[PDB]
Amino acid sequence: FPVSEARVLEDRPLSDKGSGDSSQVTQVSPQRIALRLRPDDSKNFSIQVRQVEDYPVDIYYLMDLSYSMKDDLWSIQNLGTKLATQMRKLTSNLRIGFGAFVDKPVSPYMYISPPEALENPCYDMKTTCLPMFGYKHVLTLTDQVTRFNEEVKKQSVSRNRDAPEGGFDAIMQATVCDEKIGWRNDASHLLVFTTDAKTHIALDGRLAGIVQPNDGQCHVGSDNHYSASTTMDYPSLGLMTEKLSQKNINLIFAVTENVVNLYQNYSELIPGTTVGVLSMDSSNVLQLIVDAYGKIRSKVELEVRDLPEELSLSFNATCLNNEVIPGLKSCMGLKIGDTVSFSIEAKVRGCPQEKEKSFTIKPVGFKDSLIVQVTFD
Amino acid sequence: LNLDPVQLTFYAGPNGSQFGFSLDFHKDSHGRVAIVVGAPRTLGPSQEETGGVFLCPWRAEGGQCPSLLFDLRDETRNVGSQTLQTFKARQGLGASVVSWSDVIVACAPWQHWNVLEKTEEAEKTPVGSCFLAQPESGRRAEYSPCRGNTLSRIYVENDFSWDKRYCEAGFSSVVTQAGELVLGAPGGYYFLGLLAQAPVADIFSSYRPGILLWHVSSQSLSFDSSNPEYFDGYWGYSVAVGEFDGDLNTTEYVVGAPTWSWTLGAVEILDSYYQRLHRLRGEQMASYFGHSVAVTDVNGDGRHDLLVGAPLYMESRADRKLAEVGRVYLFLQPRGPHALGAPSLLLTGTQLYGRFGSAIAPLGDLDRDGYNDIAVAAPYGGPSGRGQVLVFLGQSEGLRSRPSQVLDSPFPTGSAFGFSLRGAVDIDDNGYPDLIVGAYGANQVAVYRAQP
């Protein structure tokens, strides 16, 4: 009679520290499974992920730049130096970048009359401000932090027409442009998204005449501007949470208290995200990144990629040293260092017409992954 | 059930013009059902994309289509001490067309407008317009309800009250049976949304070619709410008409605000005075509950059951926590003592990012069994992502759970097939309504004749 059996392949030990140069710190074990399972059966396999100490962090400070945001360019204009020395004890070597956005530089989101308004939209107002930009990458993720406090002083706000902002055009380009921003692949990425108003979503740009839906490509050209922003719709939350996962990005909505309940509701639709509280003058964002890095390393919610519809799951978590919670994926309240475990039971359905497949049981925001080379004898 | 797609008829417009963005039938004086198709990117006389409308006659061979000669030239008028100025440039003349059985109300939401008084101006913005045209008598007539002339120095001193400059009126237009014209201006009152109801016969009567600013004096716009839920609601993004309050004289609008109450979205029902009868809040945020409303009796009880598209609705699966597929609601209007507002049926798409529900078309009695049968479209559904149109018959308690038949797009990928449908119009007199689908990405329109 046939029997089912499953072997590990790599199953390397979890790494205590993460300050190693290129030792390839692994935060998941095992790494490969050779699940051999008969039609209409189930054979479990247990994994144990871990948050390692001193793991590289990528703080890409993608902030709004509307006119209401000008009270905030005078606080951030010394950030980066403070963020380094105050995150230097929670990570060994971080890279900080800087994105920016207002909205689609098109009507009716921008003032296009009198013709001077396109040159500076602060024309009816007494002041002056830069023209509108959809998303202008400003600083690539760099190890040295004195490059960030210098490259924010050279930033100024641009004002729009409607209260919503084209934030999600920026969150998605910053996610699907790995070479431009410079996401360190062997690191955990925090996309601090500083805004103070609601954001447009897909099918929202039809007011501007834009109907081509977002496709998810790196349209940030060599000029470090979002090029196709006046001919491509905003990204839907569905097509944004896919990119935010596929690049292992832990989004941090660093938003204002008047809009927190708006984003505390989005972050239940985007896995692996945090919502903060930003003061009027954005003087707490230095403290807000850290509390959002201690609240996103306090969760190991497991996401599954390329799961075939036949191979169902029903997996019992393993929280702190006893807590077998069948059906849970979200052992929360963890620490920087404490390892957890999981007990995954693959519920196969029938005999797949393809002999072999493979999926991934990687945790959210971690490149380290469990690929399951499923086989069928 | 009976929309045999083996032999279509393809109507094609100028390449690169989005021919098929918005369409509607038009019964001429002889009963010759001719297709009106809106092409918001057709080149004008200045080698610039200023829309255009292609009154396609019904040919069993499809092909090209003669356009409706409209005004695509910028008009300026020094009326009073103000430089009234229309910028018909990128105006999308055809972004939403509709026909009142002899009149082609083809709108242009992104038609700008500006008035100057010696120093200042109204901050040129898309007030939109709706060019009306009788194909027989050929008498054009514009109708722009939001062409104000208040200087911008006053709007800033009124907290942007009655700031109907951003209207984009004609974004979604529907013409009632009695003869009104119900524009949807999802930028009116500073992106809070409004409607304009001016009877068609009273637009031709009160249109003088040459003067840009004029009030119809029979129109009736909506009201500028100050409820922070309404802010940035894009109210009127897609409107439809039905009968929801008993008086068969008045008609009730089915306005859909997709970004309502911080992106949640709600489809409001309101009588001819814009007093809210009903309001249907959406399930979850960032789903455009209300991007595409439709109204038809889908259970043969005499009540106008409305349908609400939620193109960006993220369903719950076992692999993806929330995989965006779209959802079409069905709020059966209760014939009993209770009230409309509980979603009777929840149709959900299958393909990720298919936007299942961005265009619903009340085909009417498609198989002649008494009950009307809508047809939903996923512009990026199907197993490949080239578009799809699903036909949901309504049996007795609302619609059928499973689509009767799907219409996989015959156009290449990117055509956005299904972005605009129309139904309940027999185009060749088989006795059965014939569905036509607007694939604007491929600059074509497909006609699906319903063989019995």
Place this chain on the structure above:
Amino acid sequence: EVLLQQSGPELVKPGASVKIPCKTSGYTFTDSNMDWVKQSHGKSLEWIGDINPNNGGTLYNQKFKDKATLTIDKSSSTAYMELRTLTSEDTAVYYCTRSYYGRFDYWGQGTALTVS
């Protein structure tokens, strides 16, 4: 002008059913439902059952659901509620209202019922 002219007063021995007919005049019958309301001795009235003229819908109050077999006469534009197993506590006035878009527009007379 539509009048929902109902029947007259009845008297019933306890434990025996009673039929309450509600004739409709003008107003083509199948436009709207034909609800029913019971007004007790304390002049507090709660409704009993709905019925759909096109096809018997029989939407009830789940409190009268047993002893209110609602019937209808589409052809003769009449509507019944056939109360059953009557008791001394269900002597009241039974209106024969019409729903129409979730209102109760038009009721008509009101059948006095008495149980001895």
Place this chain on the structure above:
Amino acid sequence: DIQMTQTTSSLSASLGDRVTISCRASQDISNYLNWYQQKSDGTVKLLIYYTSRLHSGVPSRFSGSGSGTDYSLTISNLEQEDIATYFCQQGNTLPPTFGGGTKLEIK
């Protein structure tokens, strides 16, 4: 279900005057609330529906100004023909439950 209460079950004021029939909803309903005038010896007819929509055959004095749970019928110029029991009906969720009934008295 939803229990509808009219606190003042017996209101009284002089003729030609304005009085406001209150009505409260236990559970928050929308703006679905009818109003019924029942005078002596039956003959109950429909007043304003959907919290303010005058019926076809009703004077223009009746008007309602409710929203949420707190509903009202502010009758103006109380004539001799307006003394009756006024019932408020919820008509949102099955089953539609009427009010306690406000007796009116000319003083």
